[PDB]
Amino acid sequence: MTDLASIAREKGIEFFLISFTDLLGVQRAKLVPARAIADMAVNGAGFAGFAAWLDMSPADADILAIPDPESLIQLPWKPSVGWLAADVHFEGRPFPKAPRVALKSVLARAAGKDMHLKHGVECEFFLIQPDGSAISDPADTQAKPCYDQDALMRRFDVIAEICSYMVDLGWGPYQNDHEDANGQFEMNWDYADALVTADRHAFFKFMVKSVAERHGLRATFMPKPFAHLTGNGCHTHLSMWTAAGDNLFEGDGELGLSPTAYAFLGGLIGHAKGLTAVVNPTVNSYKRLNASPNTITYGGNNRTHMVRIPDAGRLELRLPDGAANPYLMPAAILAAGLDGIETQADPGQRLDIDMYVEGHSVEAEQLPLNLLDAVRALEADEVLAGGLGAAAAAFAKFKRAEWADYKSQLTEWERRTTLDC
Amino acid sequence: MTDLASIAREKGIEFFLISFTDLLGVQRAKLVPARAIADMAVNGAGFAGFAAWLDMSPADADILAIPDPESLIQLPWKPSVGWLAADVHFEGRPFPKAPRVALKSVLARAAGKDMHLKHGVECEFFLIQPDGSAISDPADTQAKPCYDQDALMRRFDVIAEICSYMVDLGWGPYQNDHEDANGQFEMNWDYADALVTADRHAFFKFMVKSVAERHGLRATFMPKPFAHLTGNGCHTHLSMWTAAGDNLFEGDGELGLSPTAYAFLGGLIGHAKGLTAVVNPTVNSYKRLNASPNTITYGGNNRTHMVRIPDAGRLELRLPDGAANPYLMPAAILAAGLDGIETQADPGQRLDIDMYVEGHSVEAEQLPLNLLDAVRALEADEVLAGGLGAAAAAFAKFKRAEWADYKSQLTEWERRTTLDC
């Protein structure tokens, strides 16, 4: 197609943002003027990977980040800037420690079996005061705030703005909601090819953060930003397709699922523990797993299990929180799912229970309850560790560092509880 | 001898404090007038153990705390109050979950082999502002404050007072020091029969806390009370004796130790991990083990190993911190030591290294680095768990609760590091 330089001329783009996601979900970007896009579209932009979360050294050569021209997004709030998602290349080949590179690998394995992952994201977020002390709306205070029309329309301006951008960009948004915590929201768009979805996820986090700042607010995807309120989820909708456009998950077993889906499901259940460290990747993530419901169970149309079946041909994975890496998250679910399929794994009986009331009477395999045990879990699950490749160890290394960091902090809790021993 | 009522008349005691130490080292006491001492000396004082750290229920009968008349201490700063240490009795028998009861059990086992434990305590403590924000002396600020004559004599009044009390009570004190952190002190008295020492430890913590308050200050034994300073140790000096007054630890092997001592030592090294949860019993304890030196090694005249040999017939155990239970600490070291002796256990080679410089090159068995792993360690070491009896599980239960408590706190560290994911 027409080179990025040519688009830059027709559509009036003055600068490109060349962007990649590192192991921690941090967006690293670089701002290049149009007069330079041509050269980089082809050779990529040069960063020093040791400065980002990539487990590299100062002595290594600068990595090259090659833009995916198919990913261009003209910032709807600032049209002269062109945003681009990029693969980090190192010494010729794509760098297997960058998340988009790892996602694209797992996809290629699945591809060569005529299996195509498609997923949707439920990115919840709070809107907060710029200084982070409190939610953005002091009038949002009732016990059960969910779907509060009052508080919802109080933030219409910023919501509507971002939703309309999504309409224009073609993501096909269909709903905007106030969620179950004061100050918390969700905006939903259509499911798509994993890679498409992933980019959209990385960009959505940027847009909402960016737009909210322009309205003198702040967006946070943090798992548990307030001691007194529920946290941010990032539940995921999954479906496997053939190139021929057929839903491999749709079938005639129970609930409308095929045997293939139930092996995929078995894969999830099989790797739930190590999978946990990846979609609950921060010390803060583990407040949510210590409310009650930390047990490994599906499913059915029921919001009380680690997995839900909403409809024929779909699994909802109610495990990942807001801190989830947009590329590392699909990547790792895919790994565990392809295993389910390749080892014809057994999910076990369904359970139509409400686990909040009747989950104590069920004997159930339990998820890890803190980062360290979670990392330990990922480190032992070699099937998983292999599906992500060199990334897995890098991740584990960083998160073991973060653990130590958090544990070295002197809390008021320590001093209140121990000053008197 | 003359009943406590008679002493009360000669020595002018108006009230008795009947005291016991619970699983957390908390001193539970009760204030009884002299007119009532007679009855309680014999039947004990009635508390409801469910209200203290004893793993009991409201439905249980009130425990009885029988004073040990041999332990009387007339508060040197308030002579009309008589302090007494007590065994918690429950339903006839001594309650095996109370620390003094557990210490006295292990001692009785050792006793029936003509083995008598004797130990000294190095109780370090900071003096702080009453509100706990800072050390008590703003003029104590140099890099290497240890043995600072200036700052030492700046707190002469309160030190000298407490030291002189110890002279009068017969504990045989021999030195008072400013320790290696700003605001931190140590006062040393003679070693003695474990049980004697233990009471003296429980009372020392009370006296220093009490006297310092009378001087408008505050004492803390907390492991790590300040982010910027070193912590409180509670190193212990150990020696085994026969009734005939002979030091079973004194011999002709290396360094002047007998084979018996080296099996005891082996016992320690053998149970170091599970022993850790007991003498490092708080979430706060684990800052000190994550400075560098968390490795299981003795020894010799060297302050870099988990164990030190200062002289013929003595082991110094450099493992316990200020939060250590005065009864649970001897109790548990004794257990691990009697095992060493009964299984003729092997400590391994000595190592005359400085572990701060040359400890990374040694392959060494590593202690647990956080409360939970520590509790796990104690739970698996059944030899140890058996030597303390019913206490061990109670302890483990409480500390697993404390862990959850600490992990449920929302720190500023979480919010600074995660608000932006």
Author numbering:
A (entry chain C), B (entry chain C): 1 to 291, 301 to 430
Authors' account:
Monomethylamine (MMA) is an important climate-active oceanic trace gas and ubiquitous in the oceans. γ-Glutamylmethylamide synthetase (GmaS) catalyzes the conversion of MMA to γ-glutamylmethylamide, the first step in MMA metabolism in many marine bacteria. The recombinant RhGmaS was active to catalyze the ligation of MMA and glutamate to produce GMA, with ATP and Mg2+ as cofactors. Sequence analysis indicates that GmaS is closely related to, but distinct from, the glutamine synthetase (GS) family, one of the oldest and most ubiquitously existing families of enzymes in biota. However, gel filtration analysis demonstrated that RhGmaS is a dodecamer in solution, which is consistent with the result of electron microscopic analysis.
To gain insight into the catalytic mechanism of RhGmaS, the crystal structure of apo-RhGmaS was solved. In the crystal structure of apo-RhGmaS, the electron densities of residues Pro292-Trp300 are rather poor, and we could not place these residues during structural refinement, indicating a relatively high flexibility of this region. During structural refinement, we could not find the electron densities of the N-terminal His-tag, suggesting that this tag is flexible.
